[PDB]
């Protein structure tokens, strides 16, 4: 690997929990700034943004479930950073859930009011990017 | 280079496709029949002013995507006239110049992979690939 492939591998291994972590501009949030904390069993790390917690990562242990939540004050996008996820959604007005399988690079848009739950689909650590608008 | 598992192979295929060095597209899924899903398999790059862009076919259509930069390529100055954005480096290295409303000084920032910069509404910003390889950034607008 060259230097940039090396850097991308180090970043991914940090997000996966298997590596060590990798200017005074307030607008910049460096990957070195991402500190994971566990909430309800799931590991979260968010960039420093003007409005807190608008862009971050969720790290899931093998086959780990995140119980149903509801998108509220911002529309939500979930984008697979590594691994594979099952996502179950129930939009307002509908009675039948939708099931989605997402591999790396795939995303799903969760509208306001939609109820959604997430499960790591594989027997390895998976990582989801969470984008609030 | 440790022998990749299946998920590492998928991640590498995706990144090679974003870099334009790989002709195999990211893998598809039957979930791409779902209205709310935008799969990486659906992405297609279009060139504007020499820069390759590909956006997820989300409902608002121009809010989450990728910019692919040729070696040392520059994207000329733009004003974030309507939507603020976040630039998040997916591969490579970028130099970003910003001039924010109410300020006099242009500010220079260097971003490596996983680094992000927030571009406020009204800020004038330019981007140059800092290295002699294709670099890729994710563009997130709000």
């Amino acid at each position: 690997r060259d230097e940039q492939e090396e850097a991308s591998t180090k970043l991914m291994q940090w997000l996966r929990g298997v590596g060590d972590a990798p200017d005074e501009n307030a607008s910049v949030s460096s990957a070195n700034e991402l500190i994971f904390c566990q909430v309800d069993g799931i590991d979260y790390a968010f960039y420093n943004t003007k409005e807190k917690a608008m862009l971050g990562y969720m790290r899931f242990k093998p086959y780990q479930k995140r119980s149903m939540k509801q998108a509220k004050v911002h529309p939500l996008k979930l984008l697979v950073q590594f691994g594979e996820f099952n996502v179950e959604t129930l939009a307002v007005g509908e009675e039948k859930e939708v099931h989605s399988v997402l591999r790396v690079g795939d995303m799903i848009e969760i509208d306001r009011g939609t109820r959604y739950s997430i499960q790591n689909a594989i027997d390895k650590v998976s990582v989801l990017m969470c984008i609030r608008s």
Side-chain angles (χ1 to χ4, degrees), chain A:
Chain A
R1 298 188 177 110
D2 62 35
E3 183 191 16
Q4 279 77 27
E5 293 167 315
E6 281 305 329
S8 153
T9 297
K10 175 149 208 97
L11 166 69
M12 197 51 63
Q13 294 186 319
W14 168 251
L15 298 176
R16 288 168 58 191
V18 306
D20 314 330
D23 184 291
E24 284 199 293
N25 189 350
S27 309
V28 171
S29 188
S30 282
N32 74 31
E33 279 166 47
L34 297 168
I35 310 197
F36 279 90
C37 322
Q38 199 180 95
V39 170
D40 275 33
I42 281 149
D43 287 338
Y44 298 82
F46 292 89
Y47 291 100
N48 173 273
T49 49
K50 269 181 168 180
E51 183 172 359
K52 58 153 279 262
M54 297 292 280
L55 180 64
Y57 303 95
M58 309 171 45
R59 165 208 296 153
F60 284 66
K61 304 174 186 183
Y63 293 126
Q64 182 170 27
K65 287 181 179 196
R66 183 185 199 244
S67 58
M68 180 276 287
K69 308 282 168 136
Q70 193 172 46
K72 298 278 190 80
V73 317
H74 298 282
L76 173 64
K77 291 173 179 75
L78 306 168
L79 183 148
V80 181
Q81 177 74 232
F82 184 91
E84 181 182 323
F85 287 93
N86 298 329
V87 179
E88 170 176 85
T89 50
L90 182 66
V92 163
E94 312 207 271
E95 189 244 314
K96 268 171 212 236
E97 297 85 355
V98 176
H99 308 287
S100 294
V101 182
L102 310 182
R103 312 194 231 264
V104 60
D106 301 340
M107 62 152 297
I108 187 170
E109 285 171 270
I110 310 297
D111 298 335
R112 297 311 195 72
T114 290
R115 298 156 180 258
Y116 70 101
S117 68
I118 307 163
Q119 181 165 26
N120 188 355
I122 54 183
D123 62 25
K124 208 220 90 63
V125 170
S126 290
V127 179
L128 201 58
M129 182 186 289
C130 55
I131 307 164
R132 298 190 167 77
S133 286

